[PDB]
Design a protein around this ligand. Structure first.
Ligand SMILES: [Co+2]
Length: 9
């Protein structure tokens, strides 16, 4: 989750 989110952002 944490990194999926950083990527998306
Ligand atoms: Co990150």
């Amino acid at each position: 989750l944490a990194e999926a989110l950083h990527y998306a952002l």
